[PDB]
Design a protein around this ligand. Structure first.
Ligand SMILES: Nc1ncnc2c1ncn2[C@@H]1O[C@H](COP(=O)(O)OP(=O)(O)NP(=O)(O)O)[C@@H](O)[C@H]1O
Ligand SMILES: Nc1ncnc2c1ncn2[C@@H]1O[C@H](COP(=O)(O)OP(=O)(O)NP(=O)(O)O)[C@@H](O)[C@H]1O
Ligand SMILES: Nc1ncnc2c1ncn2[C@@H]1O[C@H](COP(=O)(O)OP(=O)(O)NP(=O)(O)O)[C@@H](O)[C@H]1O
Ligand SMILES: Nc1ncnc2c1ncn2[C@@H]1O[C@H](COP(=O)(O)OP(=O)(O)NP(=O)(O)O)[C@@H](O)[C@H]1O
Ligand SMILES: Nc1ncnc2c1ncn2[C@@H]1O[C@H](COP(=O)(O)OP(=O)(O)NP(=O)(O)O)[C@@H](O)[C@H]1O
Ligand SMILES: Nc1ncnc2c1ncn2[C@@H]1O[C@H](COP(=O)(O)OP(=O)(O)NP(=O)(O)O)[C@@H](O)[C@H]1O
Ligand SMILES: O=c1ccn([C@@H]2O[C@H](COP(=O)(O)O)[C@@H](O)[C@H]2O)c(=O)[nH]1
Ligand SMILES: O=c1ccn([C@@H]2O[C@H](COP(=O)(O)O)[C@@H](O)[C@H]2O)c(=O)[nH]1
Ligand SMILES: O=c1ccn([C@@H]2O[C@H](COP(=O)(O)O)[C@@H](O)[C@H]2O)c(=O)[nH]1
Ligand SMILES: O=c1ccn([C@@H]2O[C@H](COP(=O)(O)O)[C@@H](O)[C@H]2O)c(=O)[nH]1
Ligand SMILES: O=c1ccn([C@@H]2O[C@H](COP(=O)(O)O)[C@@H](O)[C@H]2O)c(=O)[nH]1
Ligand SMILES: O=c1ccn([C@@H]2O[C@H](COP(=O)(O)O)[C@@H](O)[C@H]2O)c(=O)[nH]1
Ligand SMILES: [Mg+2]
Ligand SMILES: [Mg+2]
Ligand SMILES: [Mg+2]
Ligand SMILES: [Mg+2]
Ligand SMILES: [Mg+2]
Ligand SMILES: [Mg+2]
Ligand SMILES: [Mg+2]
Ligand SMILES: [Mg+2]
Ligand SMILES: [Mg+2]
Ligand SMILES: [Mg+2]
Ligand SMILES: [Mg+2]
Ligand SMILES: [Mg+2]
Lengths: 226, 225, 226, 225, 226, 225
């Protein structure tokens, strides 16, 4: 009954290597969810992308060129999902929004990676959600939600349950994102979510193992909403 | 030296195209490219906002509104290309590597927008970053960066020199929406900050003599690490 | 029951600025007409295109380059229609005929602008009609029909009701069209219409406010037909 | 000087490719590019009409028939590219800006068709217009423009010099259909007229010495404002 | 009930010139076969391609460039089929597999020619069959089947009825294919057919005049199968 | 001289990228391009096989597995491009004519894969053939071509010199599947044979001094008609 965009982190799909079972599992659920909803997906780069970006840095590449290498990896990861989605997926990695649109019209799941430098795949997901006028944006990261601070660094981090887009920006928004930089949601994405008021859900791997219920409201993550 | 110029659409096209300015700026750019490598990106201006407003009355997404804006920036870019005559890359550049090619051919590439979510300011910063340019010159409607909006606030004072971090405080928090204005868009500010791109912000008057501006002789703002 | 191509003049959609209500109105009718017919559209450049072409002339650009600037504006205008067509339109501006074809297959209205230098959007519309083997080509200009001469210049201009393609060429056909030049139908278009015998209707803004009836034969314009 | 050559497919491929001519014309072009900037567009010829006739038996639209013709012109263009060896742009040029690039690289770009509705004659005129070429040389099956069809009418007389307006009277009225022939297609005639492109029409014999032709030494027709 | 890829030789469609009736006939049957099956096609270059490649050789072009000229001709031939297929065909010549896929989704017959140098249209057909996970690959050549040797050269040539992919490679597989070179199935194609076990049928023009039955198993050609 | 280098992904990326090697090979290439025209193609390596294996667990066709492999080869190509800094074409080359352009700009083009059905070895051979290169240098995990697999067979002997026909016997029969390895893939072997491309096969040690390798001073294999 609705349109949903999924932003799956590269480190979730590829922790250090591919998590075969998670991919097979996540691909199965997206397929099921697409049985009654319009589904579009964006995959991240993760550990592997940072390794290639670190190499380029050793050669002093510009931050723009590293972004491109990062983009190249995200597309590689995206192809692993497309593979696991079998015939329900759009064969090739989508590179622009209009094409994602066509895939949806053909009732096939479009899987895309990065687009242009200056941001992360989160921003791609947000803009996609916005372009398709999606009803839900599901961000699957390697943290169970959005906290008061970095849950892996701070001990007093509070896992916010609900919040406004303006509140999400306060958390991030002021971050100077370098090629390889990581966050729950990149500053640009936050601004896009706030900009047009995109209902957004942030969840971890554990909760991501039950998407069908997650998109029903039953999950233990954060819910950014106007 | 490698220099990237970010010319505001409102400066190039106030209401209708500003022939005289386009013309004078074309001569400056031509003069500068004689001893320097020049690349250029142009904005949307009044025309971009007008078409974006129409799309708004039809409830278009912000993403589609951005695309329309990008289309307008490319049309404006073509007017500058016309002005530069034989010193310009004949077509609107849409990728950074193509700009690189243009430069390899001793030609001036003129870009318009690229993708949604930001403005041409970001395109010019990314381009400067990409080409490892020595300098980014931003030509806009104000003569520099002020402590506040010079056209609104009476207490606004011009900041002659600052660091990316400071420029960031003056901006970076505004959520850029289709057609939104800013002395420098947030994203562009973060790009400049992340790479430490030497940036100069000047107005139309200073633009009349880019040869002096690139030497630090201007009344605008200089931003550098 | 049929396939129709609409050639809407840029000066009709954008007299000096956008005519919001006409666009909203025209977009609504095309949507309705597409409920039972296959619809494809081409939009012109109008006043705005001539302003940009005039600027380039001051810099002595070649007629080819001005054509390109003209093309750039037509695509901008086309996006305003796509905007007003909402979800019934193909998201991006179509640039070639094969793509217009796909849009039609997806049962979405393809809106295109110019293609290559040397002509006007009229020629694009005619070739489109021809490519899709359309049954009707509807040219909406800022004149109520094809006259014996320019209705805005000559006082003895006769508003022909019907005519043959060979007759339309006599009117135009011998025109040397420069970048920015305007006419009821450019010489090339005329030749295409005559070439394959495309049933063509030319109408003004007033009549264009009732397309549904116009495509039924009830209108006060001209009807070029084999 | 900047020169654009419009070589008829029927001259290049009469029935089968004309090896000797392709070969000799390649040498002339190579010789000319030594001191001039050279760009080239090739037509479809006998082969184009043959494939177009087949599509006709299947009731294809004139537009699709044009596309097929364009495909043939590009194949022919590749034979000339082969002939020019290292002096040519390695691939068939399809845009005018790419032709421009080729020229910037001191390479000879060879184009085939572009879009439906006209022929390669128009492509060469638009290209000449685009590059602001000094001269457009049309090599065809006749040795010049005559008052009438030289291969049909006994009274046809060769016109040594004329203006675009006159060339226009001799053509411009014919409704160009897929594969239609003409000493110069109407659209091309209007392009030449609108920009005042100095044009020279010559046959195969004169083609053997392009170095003399570009100096005005030929038995063909010269068209200029 | 199945997906079929047809590899039609250029010399079969264009012996020396186009065989109008064979094309009209072959186009009609493919249309009928597509009524109940998913059909995709690849056309060859034939005599004409070799003529252009021979010309380039006289100018000493590299084998790669000749491959490109060969490719250009195959696309020309492909357009003749598209023409004969009328509205049941995808309008433009397909150049990559993903696009062939879309055409099939739109339930239109995708007709493609060559892709990249180094091989023949046979290899394109095999890889296509493989990409679409086709159930049958039908190779229509100008010989009634795969023989022990060249039926036009050797007098003791045995027309094998059935065989394994590994057996087909023994026949070919070791061939050094130059631009313009011809064979029942190019070495690369053979390897692709063997690689993923593609059920393949090789037939001549005569048998090709009854595709519907051919795809049923009733034909007098060869049947390469795992 | 015109030289094409075919650097194995496993040499460039054994497990993780081999910084030191990438770095050293970048210097060699830079040194060589000083007096020669250089073009490069990089393979997939360990990473390509890893992603291809994952796709295999999902029953992907061999064609899709090839595409994934091509994507990995392009990522690796970008690491080399980074290493070559200003001497390289800024983006991954995907067509042979673009490689040609890069060379026209005195820049080093680095390609990854192109189409399915073969490996990067074939891409480099076709590229060498295309550019009419004087030499094809294949850098891999072994130090030359042996009578048998040097890492398996104890009797394997290194062949110092041979003809395409002989190289063909040692390979050419293996049915290349997604991610399959070979000192030289069959298709590449047939390309080398059909045009008679002078080819040199060397290992990582010799790669450290490409200036000597291109002169015939190496411990690898030389293949030529
Ligand atoms: N307030 C916060 N709440 C939750 N996570 C936070 C917060 N602040 C910082 N983080 C960090 O965000 C990380 C999350 O996202 P990130 O590493 O960027 O992965 P990803 O986006 O899922 N993957 P990919 O697309 O491949 O980069 C955590 O593991 C934290 O280190
Ligand atoms: N602190 C400040 N310093 C200078 N200008 C400011 C400041 N704060 C706000 N502004 C505004 O910034 C405007 C500047 O830029 P902007 O309108 O976005 O034009 P542009 O970027 O030159 N054009 P274009 O590319 O077509 O949008 C001024 O005219 C002010 O209204
Ligand atoms: N015989 C005629 N009948 C009707 N109009 C004529 C005739 N002869 C000349 N004209 C002119 O044609 C004009 C019409 O078309 P034109 O100005 O080119 O607008 P358009 O094609 O609708 N717009 P666009 O696509 O943006 O250029 C009129 O307003 C007349 O000045
Ligand atoms: N007045 C004329 N002067 C010269 N030729 C004429 C004239 N009128 C008609 N023609 C015809 O023009 C033909 C010329 O051009 P055409 O057959 O179209 O060849 P092409 O343009 O050289 N080839 P291609 O690009 O492959 O079509 C002659 O052979 C005549 O039959
Ligand atoms: N063992 C064999 N069995 C059958 N044909 C064979 C065999 N060995 C060699 N051939 C040759 O294969 C030829 C067949 O294919 P070929 O000439 O390449 O045409 P094609 O592939 O149908 N056309 P195209 O795609 O345009 O090249 C025959 O006419 C024989 O000369
Ligand atoms: N006769 C032979 N001579 C040399 N190597 C051989 C021979 N036969 C088999 N091999 C194998 O060839 C391997 C060589 O190449 P390969 O593993 O495919 O790496 P690569 O091509 O350098 N890398 P990439 O482009 O990423 O695949 C060796 O390590 C051997 O296991
Ligand atoms: O649209 C995109 C997607 C990715 N990246 C580059 O790829 C990295 C990996 O992406 P992700 O995993 O962080 O989303 C980013 O940090 C970044 O430098 C971009 O520049 N733009
Ligand atoms: O890379 C770009 C350039 C422009 N725009 C759209 O064009 C407008 C006009 O650009 P500018 O004048 O603001 O730079 C922007 O505000 C915006 O919506 C983009 O989305 N992305
Ligand atoms: O396919 C096209 C469409 C438009 N134009 C240029 O755009 C102008 C505006 O188009 P229109 O409004 O006249 O159709 C034309 O006069 C002309 O120079 C072209 O060259 N080719
Ligand atoms: O820019 C072009 C070039 C060629 N053709 C098609 O190719 C034919 C062969 O071209 P030529 O030999 O007539 O120039 C034309 O008659 C025609 O149908 C076009 O449509 N447009
Ligand atoms: O994907 C392709 C298709 C065709 N060709 C060139 O076209 C010729 C004609 O193709 P075909 O008729 O042999 O299939 C081939 O022999 C060859 O040199 C290629 O290089 N690659
Ligand atoms: O032109 C190419 C290059 C690479 N690959 C895929 O990438 C793999 C990795 O390439 P390489 O390391 O084997 O050269 C190949 O085995 C294969 O499946 C291709 O299909 N075609
Ligand atoms: Mg992410
Ligand atoms: Mg994230
Ligand atoms: Mg700007
Ligand atoms: Mg700004
Ligand atoms: Mg119009
Ligand atoms: Mg009109
Ligand atoms: Mg011609
Ligand atoms: Mg002609
Ligand atoms: Mg074949
Ligand atoms: Mg065959
Ligand atoms: Mg390799
Ligand atoms: Mg190998």
């Amino acid at each position: 009954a609705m349109r949903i965009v999924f932003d799956i982190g590269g480190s979730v799909l590829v922790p250090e290597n591919p998590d075969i079972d998670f991919i097979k599992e996540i691909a199965y659920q997206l397929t099921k969810v697409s049985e009654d909803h319009e589904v579009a997906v964006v995959v991240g780069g993760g550990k592997l992308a940072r390794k290639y970006i670190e190499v380029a840095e050793k050669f002093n590449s510009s931050e723009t060129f590293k972004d491109f290498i990062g983009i190249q990896i995200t597309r590689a990861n995206a192809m692993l999902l497309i593979a696991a989605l079998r015939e329900k997926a759009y064969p090739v990695v989508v590179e622009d929004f209009w094409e994602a649109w066509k895939a949806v019209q053909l009732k096939k799941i479009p899987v895309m990676g990065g687009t242009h430098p200056g941001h992360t795949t989160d921003a791609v997901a947000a803009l996609l959600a916005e372009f398709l006028k999606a009803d839900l944006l599901v961000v699957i990261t390697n943290v169970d939600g959005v906290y008061t601070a970095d849950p892996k660094k701070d001990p007093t981090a509070k896992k916010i349950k609900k919040m406004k887009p303006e509140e999400l920006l306060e958390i991030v928004g002021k971050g100077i994102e370098k090629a390889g930089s990581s966050s729950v949601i990149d500053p640009l994405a936050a601004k896009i979510i706030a900009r047009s008021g995109i209902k957004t859900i942030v969840i971890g791997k554990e909760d991501a193992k039950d998407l069908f219920r997650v998109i029903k409201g039953d999950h233990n993550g954060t819910t950014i909403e106007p």
